Amino acid sequence: INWKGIAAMAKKLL
């Protein structure tokens, strides 16, 4: 689980 990946994923839904 990459933090960056999550951050990108968090915005992904955004």
From Swiss-Prot:
Q: Name one GO molecular function term.
A: toxin activity
Q: Which InterPro entries match?
A: Mastoparan
GO cellular component terms?
extracellular region; membrane; other organism cell membrane
Q: Does the keyword Secreted apply?
A: yes
Ranges in coiled-coil conformation:
none
Alphabetized UniProt keyword annotations: Amidation, Antibiotic, Antimicrobial, Fungicide, G-protein coupled receptor impairing toxin, Immunity, Innate immunity, Mast cell degranulation, Membrane, Secreted, Target cell membrane, Target membrane, Toxin
The keyword Membrane belongs to this UniProt entry's keyword annotation: yes
Leucine amide modification sites? 14
Protein role: Antimicrobial peptide with moderate activity on Gram-positive (S.mutans, and S.aureus), and Gram-negative bacteria (S.enterica), as well as on fungi (C.albicans, C.glabrata, and C.neoformans). Also acts as a mast cell degranulating peptide. Its mast cell degranulation activity may be related to the activation of G-protein coupled receptors in mast cells as well as interaction with other proteins located in cell endosomal membranes in the mast cells. Activates G proteins that couple to phospholipase C. Does not cause hemolysis to human erythrocytes.
Which family does the record assign?
Belongs to the MCD family. Mastoparan subfamily.
For this entry, the protein name equals Mastoparan-X
Q: Which organism is it from?
A: Vespa xanthoptera
